Design a protein around this ligand. Structure first.
Ligand code: SPH
Ligand code: SPH
Ligand code: OSF
Ligand code: GLU
Ligand code: GLU
Ligand code: K
Ligand code: K
Ligand code: K
Ligand code: K
Ligand code: K
Ligand code: K
Lengths: 43, 270, 237, 243, 243, 270, 43, 237, 49
């Protein structure tokens, strides 16, 4: 496989090949107090 | 800050679980009021088996979602010239995609497809030379086909032919800002309380493209389509997606509606 | 996820005995401008406790015809205490927030409020929005199109933004801590509102016959970790 | 000159191609990347957030009211409350949700779904309801007895206002089509099943209390959900260039 | 032949491209590079040199006189001497300066500006003036009181003939547009502020001396100034090939 | 010599300062009479904060400013031939740029764009072969389309077609001098006190380009545009930029004016 | 990245990629006697 | 930056008690032709003190209608002392300069002169310049278009060239040291003028009623580090 | 296929170009270089006479 740059500016580069995902916690559970799955949420 | 974001390349496996008869563990009980999404997992609601899941997550990355050309402009010359303001609100598809993020930084690949058409809009097999000049704000804009501005000693120009493959150039992240904004709850200038200056990020406007035919066509005209492809995408703060039709090219104005999906007879009939 | 809380900022202390945890937008608490992000070269002003405290706004009544109400930030406090003074006298402003929405009824009432803070929430249901709706002041403005969120999106998907719910059977308050968000290191506090705070009723207020029917909704906001640049004379939009 | 032989494909403009191309401003230097909260790297982070389902899609329901499932004191037992197809990408209650908008941007999906329900009656209003997921094979169940033979959860009203019903990924194939368009592709082959709700006992209220209350319906993707093959969202269209 | 596939872009003539091309005179040998004083490597070296501002751009002022700010013995206090927008790339007093000609060759700018003033009255003529920089938000200040609430310098006439007023870079964004063209781009978004001059005390002269004297206005870029995105200077044009 | 020139790749940072009440340090006091530019810095005039400034300085380098193609010639054949004298005073944009330096050395990239046009100047889709020959001073210049000089055994020629991509060649730094001069306060020859021989650097004239069509066109003609791009730029002694219009192709003659910017009502109104 | 020459003469080479600036002192302060910022210019 | 100076070259010494530092064009003092830059193969002549001294030119009166005056170099001294003799007898010349402009008034006068030395300053305000303006001799010539610098540029931007100001309240003189500048190792001193020295009034001469009104401007120039090649008989343009 | 992008200049015939081109007689073997007096390498040798 080959990924070598021909042009001067990075805008000429091809698409990024690092397509992963990350933990959605900052969106799905942005709370201060931890609420474990095994526990009741409101105590 | 407080919540960390780990990185992964495959969706989560399923591991074998067993039955549970207890008063200490109640994973099914939740409280949506907190602002949190349920955290009850498969393994806790039913007895599961082991499943080594290798399904990938690549095609939903910002780069895989945004990384492909889409139409942003289409027009014909009138007198061998045409001036288009660089803005992506004319065509709704790529527009609705960009508005899924609040802020974003990205480079772009512009592909230009041109061909000659007669007065009745019927394509002609005619190879003619054309020029595309990027005129930043503050630079003198050409009045017509042969004005002096097409000397283009500083402004970038691309000259190709309708018989050559489509033209294409890459463009860097050019805003004065640290990211482009796709939602802006503010005004364009100080001392203006007018609705006509609301919701426009002026730093998102970097000029215009002026197209011409190097020499005059006799009875025909240049038909141009500009495609744009985001590259190296970086985005922040995902937004609630567009659920109503676009009306204006420059603003998000819309017409209220009372439902999104079509109705059905009974809530108990699937 | 405890159900009680005390919030103390400056010379003001707030308490609730029926909360439902506390949300921190995007998992980020308010932070100051770093030297590598900054561009304005002048030494900033940092008011401290004079501007970073709790300001209570005039209450809104949860009427029968109630669709919701919104406040823009920093617009809503643009004229309160030393926070507002500092906002007017400086060209540039940066800052986070601590929001506490209040609404108690009784165990004989039922109703549910969505309490959401949206970054860059445009009020674009009109071709030429009126300044009184984009910048409604401390009294805020009423919702006319809650289903389409006043911006052409689905109210139901507004949960993609930092939020809590005030479900009368469960809690009498919602608490949110918001960080500064913008595509800029700083901006003008009079020409741009970074956040919008909306309280929209999704389940109507109901109660057992004869119960109190006059139910207010009070909003209390506190600037947090603020800084200002570009001092001159006072100016408003 | 180095001997070359150009091949089929030459000159073509494939919108998904990925070549390096000369930059228009070779020496340009962009502004710095500053610290901004809430960065997203993959859209799977977004479909994992719960959003409201427009479940009450009936003539009588307009606006905000289409998000409310109606409960009320019964005078009969084992009755049905609601029913819906769990398929996330087809037209109906789920198309205006986050999960739906994104499922509709792709042609295939896979994964368990998170269906969370929150009760909004008064603190004194009690009740027990059974929520069930019926796997493919026939039609939605006709009575509670048939429904409870599938995957279910019995929900008890109380301080913890909500309950989750996980519709686990049970499929013959690793992926399903996002549409069930049948007249051409015969994609009804992919139907994922039904989700029905029934009274387990009854909704009981004290004297003079409201005899009807509301349930809100949340939906999100589980951690093992993924989408494949991007396609244009069918709900975004226009008749001509915007003015 | 090596298999190749040509792509979109082929054959195009991009004026900013940067390829290696065959030389017409392959074996040509240029004359030597000799020692010549004053080499310049970057044009930022040039905009850092102070040049005169055509500040007195009024009907009554012609030629050399447009460079002179007029002072004169007052019989009233706190009065205004001059006012101007600090924006270096827009039409007006600054467009014929070095800073301006070059700012007008680019689309965006950033940095602190150097505004130096030199007094030219007689050795016996004294005075104190206040020069202020008012950041964006409203209009130019209306009186000395409003002006002194911003960034200012109080200047005392004496042996040291001049004084500098640094208009520091105070902006929301890292860069600003060089034009404030509003009707299209709504670029008035970028206005950088005003610079006003007022009498701090008064210009006092001995008997029979000139009661009016002149101030010359210098401007340059500070060391943290930079420009981005080259574009054609708007002031250079023609109607046809030159004879 | 005495003043050294350090090299840098980013503009200067801002470091935090504090107040000052003193009689020893007066940075604000200057003396423009000396010939020096003020040296009062940000940190000394106001209380500043720390700012790590990384804004680059690349696009203002000689190479980034000059390094792009610009129009230097445009013409049509008359009898299937045309002779152009290589001089850049015809078109003002690139000319005004070069005249920002007093002396400069640079290589050049010439791009030639050609197309056929009829008598009414309407472009034709006609692919014809054309020849461009560089004729140095002292070499015999072709009188017409088929003279013997087009054998071109020593003179460089380029032969391409109006249907092929534009032609392009690189040219070395060719003057007899050690740099090209863009201002010359002298005469072209000894014993000449005439105004017609003033201000022209003869060593800046290296010949002419003669264009022809290899075979005669029937009723049409070759329309040619020559672009030139400076490369590897070296310059000395920056000059006061052009502030008045060009009139003559070969000299800097101009028409006096009494103002540069437009007037305003009052000097006290911004 | 790649920067390799194909042609014989250096005039064929691509644009120089060394775009920096230098101290403007020879233009902004070409004086013999040093005049420190903290001092008065004329003494 | 002292305010006094003494300049001694050859048998001539100049002094001033109200200077404003000394400028060295482009930071480079005059230097001789190096062996790697040279092309003319003959051994050069180096007059030394006979030609490298101060020559004072006839004074010009700062009148009311005064626009400025200019001298071309080496034209202005092309006929003075042994410097001029050497200039005529040789085909080639190379050299630097030391310039001292003088203009004293009193503490009861006000006025400001720009004293600039411009490399290759073309007098092109006419289609066919007259030899009497391009090469005005030791008497120099008067400015007709000072605002456009006689070359189509802005007078205000002439500060991009080596200069000083004579601001009557501050100094009575300007001093400049210029190096040789050209795109050649050497050139002809009769066919090309490398530098032009202009004195242009930007703030008019004014004074308290009754003060002396006759104010001259004297220019004194010295060749420095000169060398000549190509000896033959004397020749002028 | 290796991705390529042809540029301006393509197809042109510059009389001073210098590319390698296929030989018409690939395997041809020229006669030997024999000893001949008076070889010249540069024409500067000639103008010095
Ligand atoms: C010479 C080839 C033409 C190259 C054109 C370069 C133009 C520069 C690209 C600017 C892209 C920024 C677009 C950002 C935001 C959209 O306009 C938004 N929809 C406006 O709100
Ligand atoms: C065969 C392809 C054509 C190649 C043409 C080569 C011509 C040689 C280029 C000479 C460039 C020197 C230009 C220098 C200065 C300008 O002419 C000035 N404006 C004249 O004062
Ligand atoms: C009109 C014919 C144009 C096709 C010529 C393109 C040749 C391919 O060029 S190559 O990539 O260096 O092998
Ligand atoms: N600037 C040229 C026209 C530019 C062109 O046609 O390429 C002129 O005024 O003659
Ligand atoms: N030298 C040739 C004509 C050159 C040409 O047409 O190419 C002749 O005299 O016949
Ligand atoms: K896995
Ligand atoms: K739980
Ligand atoms: K979940
Ligand atoms: K730096
Ligand atoms: K000082
Ligand atoms: K400075």
């Amino acid at each position: 496989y080959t990924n070598i740059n021909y042009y001067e500016n990075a805008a000429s580069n091809s698409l990024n090949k690092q397509d992963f995902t990350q933990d959605p916690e900052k969106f799905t559970r942005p709370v201060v107090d931890v609420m474990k799955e095994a526990a009741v949420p409101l105590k | 800050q407080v919540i960390k974001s780990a990185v992964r390349s495959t969706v989560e496996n399923t591991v074998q679980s067993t039955h549970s008869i207890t008063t200490e563990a109640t994973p099914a009980l939740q409280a949506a009021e907190t602002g949190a999404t349920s955290n009850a997992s498969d393994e806790s609601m039913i007895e599961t088996r082991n499943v080594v899941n290798t399904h990938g997550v690549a095609e939903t990355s910002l780069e895989a979602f945004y990384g492909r050309a889409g139409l942003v402009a289409m027009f014909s010359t009138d007198g061998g010239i045409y001036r288009w303001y660089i803005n992506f609100g004319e065509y709704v598809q790529l527009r609705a995609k960009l508005e899924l993020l609040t802020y974003a930084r990205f480079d772009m690949e512009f592909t230009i497809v041109a061909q000659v058409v007669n007065a009745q809009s019927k394509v002609q097999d005619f190879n003619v030379d054309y020029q595309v000049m990027f005129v930043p704000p503050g630079a003198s804009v050409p009045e017509n086909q042969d004005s002096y501005q097409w000397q283009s000693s500083c402004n970038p120009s691309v000259i190709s032919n309708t018989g050559l493959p489509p033209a294409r150039v890459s463009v860097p992240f050019m805003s004065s800002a640290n990211a482009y904004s796709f939602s802006y709850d503010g005004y364009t200038q100080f001392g203006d309380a007018s609705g006509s200056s609301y919701g426009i990020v002026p730093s998102n406007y970097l000029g215009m493209l002026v197209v011409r035919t190097c020499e005059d066509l006799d009875g025909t005209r240049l038909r141009v389509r500009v495609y744009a492809k985001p590259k190296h995408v970086k985005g922040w703060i995902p937004r609630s997606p567009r659920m109503t039709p676009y009306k204006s090219r420059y603003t998000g104005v819309y017409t209220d509606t009372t439902k999104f999906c079509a109705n059905r007879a009974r809530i108990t009939t699937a | 996820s405890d159900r009680v809380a005390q919030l103390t900022l400056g010379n003001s202390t707030i308490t609730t005995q029926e909360a439902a945890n506390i949300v921190v937008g995007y998992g980020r608490w308010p932070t100051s401008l770093r030297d590598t992000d900054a561009t304005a070269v002048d030494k900033p002003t940092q008011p401290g406790v004079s501007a970073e405290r709790f300001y209570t706004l005039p209450s809104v009544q949860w009427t029968n015809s109630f669709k919701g109400h919104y406040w823009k930030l920093p617009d809503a406090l643009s004229e309160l205490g030393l926070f507002g003074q500092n906002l007017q006298f400086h060209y540039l402003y940066r800052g986070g927030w601590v929001i506490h929405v209040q609404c108690n009824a009784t165990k004989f009432h039922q109703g549910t409020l969505l309490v959401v803070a949206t970054p860059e929430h445009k009020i674009q249901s009109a071709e030429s929005p009126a300044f009184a709706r984009t910048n409604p002041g401390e009294q805020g403005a009423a919702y006319q199109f809650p289903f389409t969120f006043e911006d052409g999106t689905a109210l139901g998907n507004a949960l993609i933004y930092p939020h809590q719910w005030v479900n009368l059977r469960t809690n009498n308050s919602a608490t949110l801590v918001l960080p500064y968000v913008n595509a800029l290191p700083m901006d003008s506090g009079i020409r741009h509102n970074n956040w919008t705070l909306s309280v929209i009723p999704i389940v109507p207020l109901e109660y057992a016959a004869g119960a109190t029917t006059y139910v207010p909704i009070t909003v209390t906001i506190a600037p947090m970790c603020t800084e200002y640049n570009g001092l001159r004379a006072a100016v408003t939009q | 000159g180095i001997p070359t032989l150009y091949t089929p494909g030459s000159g073509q403009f494939l919108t998904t191609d990925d070549f390096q191309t000369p930059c228009m401003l070779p020496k340009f230097q962009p502004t710095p990347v500053i610290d901004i909260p809430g960065e997203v790297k993959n859209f799977l982070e977004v479909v994992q957030v719960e959003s409201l389902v427009e479940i009450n899609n009936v003539e009588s329901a307009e606006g905000v009211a289409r998000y409310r499932i109606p409960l009320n004191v019964q005078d009969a037992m084992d009755g049905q409350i609601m029913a819906l197809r769990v398929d996330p990408g087809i037209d109906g209650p789920m198309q205006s949700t986050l999960l739906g908008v994104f499922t509709r941007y792709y042609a295939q999906w896979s994964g368990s779904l998170d269906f969370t329900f929150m009760f909004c009656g008064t603190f004194m209003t009690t009740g027990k309801v059974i929520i069930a997921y019926t796997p493919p094979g026939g039609d939605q169940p006709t009575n509670r007895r048939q429904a409870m033979l599938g995957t279910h959860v019995v929900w008890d009203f109380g301080l913890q206002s909500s309950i989750t019903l996980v519709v686990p990924w049970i499929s013959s194939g690793h992926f399903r089509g996002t549409t069930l368009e049948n007249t051409i592709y015969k994609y009804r082959y992919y139907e994922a099943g039904y989700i029905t709700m029934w009274y387990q006992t009854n909704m009981v209220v004290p004297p003079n209390f409201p005899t009807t209350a509301s349930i809100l319906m949340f939906v999100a993707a589980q951690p093992n959900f993924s989408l494949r093959i991007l396609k244009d969202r069918p709900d975004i269209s226009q008749e001509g260039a915007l003015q």
